[PDB]
Amino acid sequence: KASLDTQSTQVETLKRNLIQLESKISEAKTKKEMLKARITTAKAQEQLQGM
Amino acid sequence: MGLFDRIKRVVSSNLNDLVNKAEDPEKMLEQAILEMQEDLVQLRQGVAQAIAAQKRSEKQYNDAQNEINKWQRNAQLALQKGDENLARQALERKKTYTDTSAALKASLDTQSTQVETLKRNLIQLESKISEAKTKKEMLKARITTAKAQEQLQGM
C-alpha cells in the first residue's frame, strides 16, 4: 500500500508534468506563427517593388 | 587601386546585363503571385493549425476544470471521512490546478488575440493580391492601346 501510494503520487505528478509538456509544445508552435507573420511583412516590402 | 577600379566596372556591367535579361513583367509577377499565394495558403493552414492547437489546449483546460471539481467532491468526502491528510492533499491539488488553469487561460487569451490578428492580416493579404491583379488589368488595357496604333497601319 505504501509503495502503491508513492507510485500513485508519482504517476499523478507525471500526469501533471505531461500536461505542462503539452502546454510547452503548443507555446513553441505559437512562436513559429509569430515568426511567420514577420516573414509576411518582409514579403509585403517586396510586393511594393512589384507595385 | 587598379583592381578596385576594374572590379567596379565589371560589377556594374555584369549587374546591368543580368537585370535586363530577367526584367519581364509577366514572369516576375507570376512568380511573385505564386509565392504570396503559397505563403497565404501556409498562413491559412497555420492559422487553422493554431486554432486546432487552441481547441486541443481548451480541451486540456476543460479537463483540468473537471479534475478540480472531482477534487472538490473528494474534499467534501474527506471532511465526512474525518481524515486530515486527505483534505489537505485536495486543497493543495486544487491550488496548483487553479494556477495552471489560470496560466493556460492567459496563454489561450494571448493565442486568441494573436490568431485574430493573423486572421485580420490574412484578410489584408487577400486584399493586397487582388490589388496587384487589378494593376495587371490596367497594364493590359495600355497594351491594347499600343495594338490599336498597329491596327491603324493595317487600315
From Swiss-Prot, chain B:
Annotated GO CC locations: plasma membrane
Record's protein name: Membrane-associated protein Vipp1
UniProt signal peptide: none
Cell compartment(s), UniProt: Cell inner membrane
Membrane disposition: Peripheral membrane protein
Domain of life per record: Bacteria
Function noted in UniProt: A membrane remodeling protein capable of forming rings and/or filaments on membranes, which then curve and tubulate the bilayer. Rings will form on liposomes, altering their positive curvature so the lipid bilayer is remodeled into a negative curve as the membrane enters the ring. Ring stacks of varying lengths can be seen joining isolated liposomes. A lipid monolayer can be drawn into the center of the rings. Required for thylakoid formation.
Chief subcellular location: membrane
Domain text: A helical hairpin is formed by residues 25-137 which is conserved in all known ESCRT-III proteins. Helix 5N-5C (residues 193-217) contacts the helical hairpin 3 subunits away and is essential for oligomerization. The C-terminal flexible linker and alpha-helix 6 (residues 220-256) are not required for oligomerization and do not resolve in electron microscopy.
Keywords attached to this entry: Cell inner membrane, Cell membrane, Lipid-binding, Membrane
Organism of origin: Nostoc punctiforme (strain ATCC 29133 / PCC 73102)
Gene field: vipp1
Subunit annotation: Polymerizes to form rings, filaments and ribbons. Rings are formed by stacked rungs that tilt to give a dome-shaped curvature. Rings form with symmetries ranging from C11 (55 subunits) to C17 (119 subunits).
Similarity-based family: Belongs to the PspA/Vipp/IM30 family.
